[PDB]
Copies of this chain bind each other. A is one copy, B any other.
Amino acid sequence: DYDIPTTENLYFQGSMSRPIVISGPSGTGKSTLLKKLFAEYPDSFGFSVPSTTRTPRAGEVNGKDYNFVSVDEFKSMIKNNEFIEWAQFSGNYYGSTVASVKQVSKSGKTCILDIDMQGVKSVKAIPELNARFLFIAPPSVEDLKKKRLSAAQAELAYAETGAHDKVIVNDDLDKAYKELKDFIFA
């Protein structure tokens, strides 16, 4: 009975769906596990709609391809900590807002954030999110060879500290995938 929405208290910051952060170095099969997940359950998951200051392009829909905002707005969002991550290139800003992640859950889907280590660390610094963290591992670094293998090593070391709620080692694709399902649907 805390902070119940009412006619005089029109606010809806209660409990929502927990978003799921998925990370792991590339080359582990992670993209194959997600394609399968979205193939099998195509009405359950969604991705955050990014924001940008660039001009819309042909076929682009505001609120679906991009949330198209002004530079000033974007700058006020950066300063007020509204982005999980953001970038700037060729004079244009791009980013993912905390809000866009909650927006996904509003349709009834669970948000998946497929992001890297810096991404994981940022989501951790944001108490309003409440994410679950899944890391997809190779069976061994050695296995991963076919340089920027140090990128992989540091993600592997970050995972050792018990950052993620679950590590899935992908030495077998079918079992990896059933562990992905068991985790996501717990």
Question: Which residues of A are at the interface with B, using a C-beta cutoff of 8 A?
Answer: 24, 26-27, 29-32, 34-35, 55-60, 68, 87, 89-91, 114, 116, 147-148, 151
In the assembled complex, how far is the CB of residue A45 from the closest CB belonging to chain B, in whole angstroms? 16
Copies in the complex: 2
| Bound complex: CA A59 to CA B31 (Å) | 5
The 3 A-B pairs at the shortest CB distance, nearest first, are namely A31-B59, A31-B57, A26-B56
| Bound complex: CA A114 to CA B60 (Å) | 13
- Cβ B58 vs Cβ A30 within 8 A: yes
Partner of A148, one of B31, B35, B55: B55
Cβ-closest chain B residue relative to A70: B147
